[PDB]
């Protein structure tokens, strides 16, 4: 995993609070969320990279991400 454990966990608990009060988390639940998030971001960066290269660049930019996410239907 490429993101640090503790800040990710902190983020997850923060986001979760705005949906439901008094929540706890199984350890493997947080690990599940991290595996899923990282996998998503890596895949998105693959598509983003394809968009950058399409525009004859080697540098990824926000517009590359936005094109990738629009075509994905996000």
């Amino acid at each position: 995993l490429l993101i640090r454990k503790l800040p990710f966990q902190r983020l997850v608990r923060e986001i979760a609070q705005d949906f439901k009060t008094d929540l706890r988390f199984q350890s493997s639940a947080v690990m599940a969320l991290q595996e899923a998030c990282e996998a998503y971001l890596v895949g998105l960066f693959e598509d983003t990279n394809l968009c950058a290269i399409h525009a004859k660049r080697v540098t990824i930019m926000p517009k590359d991400i936005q094109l990738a996410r629009r075509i994905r239907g996000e």
């Binding site: 800040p7 439901k20 988390f25 639940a29 599940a32 969320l33 899923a36 998105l44 693959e46």
Partner: protein, 69 residues
């Protein structure tokens, strides 16, 4: 807490994604994207948790959310 997902971490994720060069504006953008994805999954996960009348989000709650997405 979103700023805890640091620049070098995002860089590592991008390298696994095959990216060689990265604009400075990517990091914030990535954070926004990450947040949206997390909020969506977690919103569903907790829904499952609440249906089961539990206060603890389980790995299965997350798995079901991910599956249904």
């Amino acid at each position: 807490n979103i700023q805890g997902i640091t620049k070098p971490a995002i860089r590592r994720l991008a390298r696994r994604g095959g990216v060689k060069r990265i604009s400075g504006l990517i990091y914030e953008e990535t954070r926004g994207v990450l947040k949206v994805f997390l909020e969506n999954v977690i919103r569903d996960a907790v829904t499952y948790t609440e249906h089961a009348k539990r206060k603890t989000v389980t790995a299965m709650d997350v798995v079901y959310a991910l599956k249904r997405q």
